[PDB]
Write a protein that binds this DNA or RNA. Structure first.
Ligand SMILES: [Mg+2]
Ligand SMILES: [Mg+2]
Lengths: 320, 71, 130
RNA sequence: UUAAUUGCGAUAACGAACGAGACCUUAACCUACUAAAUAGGGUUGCUGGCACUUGCCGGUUGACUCUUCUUAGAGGGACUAU
């Protein structure tokens, strides 16, 4: 069932480091902000005309070191960048100038998260701490509880929780081999998740906000319930799964293995497609794997940022 | 000196054009400027790495000796 | 003329042998690991140590290498060593319970006073010219 | 193999010490931080001239503002990275 094929449609060249992270806003479907190892963000405007799927719009210089995680705002006009210089930068997606410079992390920041609304900034850093900031730039909360580096923090979207609660729930994980849930208004702890043999590289709540998908070094992908606080399922990737992403339309998990990109069909608990682009002049042992994955707003296109300084887009082309 | 100043103006004008196009114009414009520049006299956008060598005792030059007698 | 003298090589070897699960393929992550898990005094030595650690990690990823060892590799070696075939490789499991000998060891078996089902065959005492 | 008794190694040699390296000063790169009437810049004053269109080149220790260059501190950066 669902004989869905996805074919590479364009390549977004222009970066100079590994495209570490990607982000896309639901409101604005034709804009894609990507941060790389070249200490710069790039805003891409997508064109449905011919080979190249997008067009760079603005480069955001101002970061001294590696740019690790990138997050765009809900409205699609602001972008928060986490870099390896222990600072966070807020950028206007049109002006190109920085608005706020969040400072206070003693370790280089690995991940940042946007609030569901435009209120709070959640950042994870190597200093074993999480920081909650206002949009102005000051740090409101210093959440502790992790004894090691925290690699990833992305918010669980409130879908239909009771009506309304005004409570901000997200997850955090890193080299503590644990996954933690946090709730904000106040701004304290929630349930735990301990399933990983090795350390967690990346976690990601489902688009609805009721499934949390975590991955690590051993390629053991775990799916948990947050609102039910229990495990949902478990798979093995048998390679180094660098990043993973849910899909808005389909019930899918893209996983960036060290060999290629797997897609797992969640309802059938079986992988369906494997993505391995064709390079040239290599030795098959160092083919550029994927580090960033991001689906489109509708769920029709997939952006993968590799280690060869390239974004590649796979458009869903169902060949019957 | 004179020619050093001239090369300084060269690089300054080129870098100003590139930076302005990056900041306020567009990405492709700046990339096209960089393709036109760096394909010609790379120093137009990259500062020269060569700087003078400190002098040392035992010679009138930075890396030259005075002379020997032997007799 | 970069040869990476004793200190960096030994430190990287110990780093791998004590921290393989945490080390990665990337230079920058391993640089941060070298900063946090080890007290290298200067930073040029830190960069050299991280670089050689990355090189040794890449060599390990390509395959097993001499000198260095770690928990996972020695466990794998022990598990491969514990391999014992279920099928017998002796006691005439092959050649339909018949093993071939010559006269001399047949008389050896006979004088030993043991039954030992055998199969005689002359060895054609003419030797190969090589 | 290395500039190196620098390493890979083979081994009645095993572990080590000095030297080399490491290390400091200095020269780069920092539109990332801290800042500056004993360094510079912008806007605007108060003026000079030429143009006459709102502009050009100037002067003022008059004000507001900034740190790109000039400085110097904490740091980053290169480890033969891919
Ligand atoms: Mg001279
Ligand atoms: Mg400066």
């Amino acid at each position: 069932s669902s004989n869905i094929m996805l074919v590479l449609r364009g390549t977004l060249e222009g970066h100079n480091g590994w495209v570490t992270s990607l982000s896309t806003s639901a409101a604005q479907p034709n804009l894609l902000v990507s941060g790389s190892r070249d200490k710069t963000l790039i805003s891409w405007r997508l064109t449905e005309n011919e080979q190249q799927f997008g067009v760079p719009v603005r480069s955001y210089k101002g970061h001294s070191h590696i740019v690790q995680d990138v997050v765009v705002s809900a409205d699609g006009n602001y972008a928060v960048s986490a870099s390896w210089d222990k600072t966070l930068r807020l950028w206007n997606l049109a002006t190109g100038n920085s608005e706020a410079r969040f400072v206070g992390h003693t370790g280089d920041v690995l991940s940042v998260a946007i609030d569901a609304n435009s209120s709070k900034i959640i950042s994870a850093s190597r200093d074993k701490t999480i920081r909650v900031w206002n949009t102005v730039g000051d740090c409101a909360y210093v959440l502790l509880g992790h004894t090691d580096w925290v690699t990833k923090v992305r918010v669980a979207p409130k879908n239909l929780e009771d009506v309304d609660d005004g409570r901000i729930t997200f997850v955090s994980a890193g080299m503590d081999k644990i996954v933690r849930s946090w709730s904000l208004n106040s701004y304290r702890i929630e349930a735990d998740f301990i399933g990983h043999n090795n350390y967690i590289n990346v976690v990601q709540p489902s688009p609805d906000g009721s499934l949390a998908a975590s991955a690590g070094k051993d390629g053991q992908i775990y799916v948990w319930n947050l609102k039910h606080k229990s495990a949902f399922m478990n798979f093995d990737a048998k390679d180094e799964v660098f990043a993973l992403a849910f899909s808005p339309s389909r019930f899918w998990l893209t996983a960036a293995t060290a060999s290629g990109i797997k897609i797992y069909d969640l309802e059938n608990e079986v992988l369906i497609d494997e993505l391995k682009p064709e390079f040239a002049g290599y030795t098959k042992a160092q083919d550029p794997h994927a580090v960033s994955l991001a689906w489109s707003a509708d769920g029709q296109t997939l952006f993968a940022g590799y280690t060869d300084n390239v974004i590649r887009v796979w458009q869903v082309m169902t060949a019957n | 000196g004179h020619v050093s100043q001239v090369y300084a103006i060269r690089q300054a004008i080129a870098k100003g054009l590139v930076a302005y196009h990056q900041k306020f114009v567009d990405e492709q414009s700046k990339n096209e400027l960089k393709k036109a520049f760096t394909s010609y006299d790379r120093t137009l956008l990259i500062a020269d790495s060569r700087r003078p060598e400190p002098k040392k005792f035992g010679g009138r030059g930075a890396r030259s000796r005075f002379q020997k007698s032997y007799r | 003329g970069r040869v990476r003298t004793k200190t960096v090589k030994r430190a990287s070897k110990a780093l791998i042998e004590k921290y393989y699960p945490k080390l990665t393929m990337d230079f920058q992550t391993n640089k941060r690991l070298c900063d946090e898990i080890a007290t290298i005094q200067s930073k040029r030595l830190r960069n050299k140590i991280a670089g050689y650690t990355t090189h040794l990690m890449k060599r390990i990823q390509k395959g097993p290498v001499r000198g260095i060892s770690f928990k996972l590799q020695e466990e794998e070696r022990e598990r491969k060593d514990q391999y014992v075939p279920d099928v017998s490789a002796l006691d005439l499991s092959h050649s339909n319970d018949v093993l071939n000998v010559d006269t001399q060891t047949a008389e050896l078996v006979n004088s030993l006073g043991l039954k030992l089902p055998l199969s005689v065959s002359s060895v054609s005492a003419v030797r190969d010219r090589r």
